[PDB]
């Protein structure tokens, strides 16, 4: 139908879906795949600033995001495997065992364990209009 | 001029409906509550109506208080009730009660004492030329127009199933349910509140009510529906609160109405509708049963859920012997069906003797309306 | 000659305003302080009045001291207060109080004790026929003729937001802000000092008061305004001191008024007017809210600054649901609003019964005014 | 060394109570706020902790800002909570999380989602071997050890009546009440500000709260005492404020607590506690009800005021039928009894399987705690 199938929010070119439920990162990816959506990846601050619009979604929830970490290198990429700019990348802890692809907790990107459950957000291109 | 109509007023638990006979549907329908400022306090001037409620309360919402003088569909009080009747006549109908006959309608177990009082008001204060006392269950049936079948009537306060064979309702078959939309909304509130919303208030009451009526639906399979819910994108539907919050409502929509099917949600021991239907059937003769099964009729506000009909056929068919044919029917605007039947009976030229008259009030007293008449 | 006028004395913190009910605006208006030569010094001759204050004090500036019995609206001491009243009646009004029923205004959490005291003075010393006492905000609200809305009142001493539904100030929602008015001027003296000016004195405070009212404005954006300031050819405006000094002003301009929006300038913990409206908004029912958002009015002298309405609208939407409509209404001569409210209510012949009589005063004591009336 | 404690931590709205199971009382208690200099203003050198709160802020009172992640019991924000827990174990408990299994308690209607979140934090950040999260109400009831009865449980944020029959709490029966100690504290400042005083600020809330406990008593007869008020010398009892000031109190003393009986004071429509209990009792079977009447247990916090029991007995006697036995029981120091329940529950060896484990977390995710257990 319209630029976004229902229950999706549009921001410019993109369409976003905030999942009702918790899924694992990989799992949500498969789920996202079903739609033909992807996980959301944040190319710009502008897009990141839009996240706040999640804020109305009740409370902040952690939301799985595109960025993934290699493990040996620990380099952060998105599913497409581009490089996030500095702004996107994660924050530090003293140390421990474990770490995986980022989520979004409200304002800022974060990292966690995949095995854990988190809400994921998917992104698709809106049917951009041409005349 | 000459000729007379019958005023058809059904004194609903929540919403009373009244009109003229011959009308297809009630001219008036308004809240049946009483309400004031809880806070009050005070002002320069007034111009307020202390406890109209009515339309104005509903618009009123935040300010006012609600009593229902007939919550359990039973005139719990005469003082307020007169007010409803007064409002109905003068305000909404803008008829003079002097001119026309009225049919009041009554809830099913209405103790023969109140009936006399119902009558005495109409004669005494109202001074109607004549009035009839009706049983709303009946009037609903009258509207339907079918002799045999087993109809499920779920309204606001109460749910019944009644087998009907030629036209006579077999008393014994019937069984009562406490549950109806009345409970449903409360429940809706309660589930809503878990998530974090708090819908404690009366204003909030009405908000909850709105949410269920548009929003809520009945599941094909209760179990499947939960399971789906997890994946379910769809269920997520938004509702905008009057303030401007937007609150999201997935699962509750199906869970709420489910209660009718499974009363234990609400903590009713009582069996769900389907068990009800089966039971009422059993109670009757083996021979008759087929007739009911073919003709099941739905009725009342609570029956309006889309999906009910298919669930019912699904449910019943499992229960019933594979031979027996099962049909389900649901007339389109059933909620009104009570008023409708009332309307019809009232109008009846032929039946007119049935109406209760001023003299009869005098000689026999109001009790006449109860005895060897309605 | 007959009939009577209501003497609507509004005892203001800084300014007494009083006149006759029915009048469009306050007749006579003057600063409430008490002052006498601090220095004194003697002379040959006399012909100075010890502590009139009033107008004569203002031009008086260097010579006099000040004293506000009415400090925070609340009448702290009766003796001076009576002096004000005597002056008001006799000097400005030139009218003898025995003749006219009078309504007095009083501040928000004014204790019962003082209210009674107010009555004693009005009856005993003045011997007016009857009095009424009023609560200033309601008089303001009365003046408006707004049944519903959420209003910002900002005057001299205190700033409130009260939502109203049906002419009812819902007590709970209301909140107070310490600051107004005063806090602006003092901040104004202080921020001014830093530049190198000293405005410590009383005369100087008067000077300082002068500047803010003409000089100051509020910004579209604090952050943006601050950035701009460096360029700002504009802000630089000059103010000539009564001695004849000139000063440059203008980063000051926006900043002082800034206080209301972010009290931390003052060091005030409390939240901004904007957030204060929001807090109040939530306090009310969700249902009521659209009404409030739609009807927002600001009241009081502090509300007069140009630009506020546009700012407030902007501030509030940012708060608000997005869907919801926004309106900011500001009536033109609002400062006088309280007095006007004084005049209308006072002037109500219909209402006249409210007027408190010496008979009640003697029998009931002054208390009758407080209890069951105003 | 072998065998293990259960770390029983009680995340209260205002206060956390914590310590080892089997412990007669919680060892450590401290406020739940977050607090860093509002003013700040730098200096030379630091040494301060940005927002420890707990004990130290309380001593800090003038300086600091207060926040409750735990506002209405429910944890709104994880970080501060992470902080709160960090303090709990390390600073106050001086225990290490890895060593001991921990219980955690929860507000009544807690969203599942946060349950997994709570569950998440302790394992991940704390790296506790195993955890249990229990419902505070349930622990309290555990503490009583009363299989049956009806207990009135009034703490800080909320008030409940929970009928209990045979170790089961019947969910339909139990109603809520927003009003609770927090409202009382706010309430009391307001009426005190009424006469003289102004207790706007955070410190002042603490001051009033101090007044609140020592000062407050319930009145035998609301009406009567007011009559008593004029004559009463006794009421006048005096309090000295943290500066110099010594303030007088006395009518407000009873009046504040009055709210529990009359919620309207605070603007609450809802029925009083006496009201609440009756309704809840009616909710249950007639047969059972005798039980609740015999056993009514007080609980929490707000129930401590002397003389509540008899008034409570009185009100209920009035409500009840004449025959009925009524008995009120209030355990001597109930506030803790929430924590008490935990200590036992945690401490239960037999029960020990009950605890949630790292593996159950690991397989199940966190939700195992929520699902099919606590
Ligand atoms: N379209 C609808 N869908 C679902 N429920 C409805 C609908 N319309 C009304 N209801 C519910 O049914 C009730 C009205 O039905 P009614 O037969 O008038 O009940 P009663 O006769 O017992 O008052 C209302 O309480 C409402 O909650
Ligand atoms: N035109 C104006 N622009 C800005 N501020 C004003 C204006 N007129 C009055 N004020 C300020 O508002 C105050 C008067 O408002 P008012 O409502 O009378 O306060 P209050 O009722 O608390 O005494 C004065 O202290 C003055 O500083
Ligand atoms: N001795 C007492 N007398 C009166 N009130 C008390 C007393 N002790 C505590 N309180 C009040 O009860 C509250 C603590 O009770 P609690 O059951 O812990 O509440 P919650 O569990 O909701 O936090 C405090 O807010 C306090 O104001
Ligand atoms: Ca993108």
UniProtKB/Swiss-Prot annotation, chain A:
GO CC list: cell surface; membrane
Every C-type lectin domain range: 11-123
Keyword Disulfide bond among record annotations: yes
Extracellular topology ranges: 1-131
Compartments where located: Membrane
Keyword Transmembrane helix attached: yes
Membrane topology: Single-pass type II membrane protein
Phenotype when the gene is knocked out: Deficient mice shown no alteration of dendritic cell phenotype and numbers and the response of dendritic cells to innate stimuli is not altered. No alterations are found in leukocyte numbers or frequencies in spleen, lymph node or thymus, and mice appear normal and do not develop any obvious symptoms of autoimmune disease.
Disulfide bridge positions per record: 4-15, 32-122, 101-114
Domain of life, source organism: Eukaryota
UniProt note on tissues of expression: Isoform 4 expressed at high levels by CD8(+) dendritic cells (DCs), and at low levels by plasmacytoid DCs but not by other hematopoietic cells.
Protein's GO biological process: positive regulation of cytokine production; receptor-mediated endocytosis
Signal peptide span: none
A molecular function (GO) term: carbohydrate binding
Keyword tags: Disulfide bond, Glycoprotein, Lectin, Membrane, Receptor, Signal-anchor, Transmembrane, Transmembrane helix
Positions annotated with a glycan in the UniProt record: 26
Subunit note: Isoform 1: Monomer. Isoform 4: Homodimer.
Known function: Functions as an endocytic receptor on a small subset of myeloid cells specialized for the uptake and processing of material from dead cells. Recognizes filamentous form of actin in association with particular actin-binding domains of cytoskeletal proteins, including spectrin, exposed when cell membranes are damaged, and mediate the cross-presentation of dead-cell associated antigens in a Syk-dependent manner.
The protein, known as: C-type lectin domain family 9 member A
Organism classification: Eukaryota, Metazoa, Chordata, Craniata, Vertebrata
UniProtKB/Swiss-Prot annotation, chains B, C, D:
Statement: the UniProt record of this protein carries the keyword Ubl conjugation: yes
Effect of residue 70 to A: Decreased interaction with SETD3
Effect of substituting residue 145 to D: In CSMH; somatic variant
Keyword Nucleus carried by entry: yes
Membership in a protein family: Belongs to the actin family.
Subunit structure: Polymerization of globular actin (G-actin) leads to a structural filament (F-actin) in the form of a two-stranded helix. Each actin can bind to 4 others. Identified in a IGF2BP1-dependent mRNP granule complex containing untranslated mRNAs. Component of the BAF complex, which includes at least actin (ACTB), ARID1A, ARID1B/BAF250, SMARCA2, SMARCA4/BRG1, ACTL6A/BAF53, ACTL6B/BAF53B, SMARCE1/BAF57 SMARCC1/BAF155, SMARCC2/BAF170, SMARCB1/SNF5/INI1, and one or more of SMARCD1/BAF60A, SMARCD2/BAF60B, or SMARCD3/BAF60C. In muscle cells, the BAF complex also contains DPF3.
Protein name according to UniProt: Actin, cytoplasmic 1
Organism: Homo sapiens (Human)
Protein encoded by which gene: ACTB
């Amino acid at each position: 139908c319209s630029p976004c199938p229902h229950n999706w929010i549009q921001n410019g070119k993109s369409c976003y879906y905030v999942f009702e439920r918790w899924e694992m990162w990989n799992i949500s990816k498969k789920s996202c795949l079903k739609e033909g959506a992807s996980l959301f990846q944040i190319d710009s601050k502008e897009e990141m600033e839009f996240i706040s619009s999640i804020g109305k979604l009740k409370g902040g929830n952690k939301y799985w995001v595109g960025v993934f970490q290699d493990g040996i290198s620990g380099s952060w990429f998105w599913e497409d495997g581009s490089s996030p700019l500095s702004d996107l990348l994660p924050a530090e802890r003293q140390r421990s065992a474990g770490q995986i692809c980022g989520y979004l907790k409200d304002s800022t990107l974060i990292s966690d364990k995949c095995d854990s459950w988190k809400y994921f957000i998917c992104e698709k291109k809106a049917f951009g209009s041409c005349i | 001029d000459d000729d007379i109509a019958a005023l058809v007023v059904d004194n609903g638990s929540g919403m009373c409906k009244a009109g003229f006979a011959g009308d297809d549907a009630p001219r008036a329908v308004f809240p049946s509550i009483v309400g004031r400022p809880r806070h009050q306090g005070v002002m320069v001037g007034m111009g307020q109506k202390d406890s109209y409620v009515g339309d104005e309360a509903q618009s009123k919402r935040g300010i006012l208080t609600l009593k229902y003088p007939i919550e359990h569909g039973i005139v719990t009080n005469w003082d307020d009730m007169e007010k409803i009747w007064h409002h109905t006549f003068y305000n909404e109908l803008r008829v003079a009660p002097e001119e026309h006959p009225v049919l009041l309608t009554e809830a099913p177990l209405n103790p023969k004492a109140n009936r006399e009082k119902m009558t005495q008001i109409m004669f005494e204060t109202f001074n109607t030329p004549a009035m009839y006392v009706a049983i709303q269950a009946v009037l609903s049936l009258y509207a339907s127009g079918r002799t045999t079948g087993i109809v499920m009537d779920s309204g606001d306060g109460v749910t019944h199933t009644v087998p009907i064979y030629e036209g006579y309702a077999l008393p014994h078959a019937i069984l009562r349910l406490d549950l109806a939309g009345r409970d449903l909304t409360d429940y809706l509130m309660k589930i809503l509140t878990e998530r974090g919303y708090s819908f404690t208030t009366t204003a909030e009451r009405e908000i909850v009510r709105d949410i269920k009526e548009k929003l809520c639906y009945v599941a094909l399979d209760f179990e499947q529906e939960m399971a789906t819910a997890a994946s379910s994108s769809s269920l997520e539907k938004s509702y905008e609160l009057p303030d401007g919050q937007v609150i999201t409502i997935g699962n509750e929509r199906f869970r709420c109405p489910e209660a009718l099917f499974q009363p234990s949600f609400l903590g009713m021991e009582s069996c769900g509708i389907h068990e009800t239907t089966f039971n009422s059937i059993m109670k009757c003769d083996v021979d008759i049963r087929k007739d009911l099964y073919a003709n099941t009729v739905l009725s009342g506000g609570t029956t309006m859920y889309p999906g009910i009909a298919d669930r019912m056929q699904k449910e019943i068919t499992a229960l019933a012997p594979s031979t027996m044919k099962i049909k389900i029917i649901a007339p389109p605007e059933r909620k009104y069906s009570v008023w409708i039947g009332g309307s019809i009976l009232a109008s009846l030229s032929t039946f007119q003797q049935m109406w209760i008259s001023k003299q009869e009030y005098d000689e026999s007293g109001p009790s006449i309306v109860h005895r060897k008449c309605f």
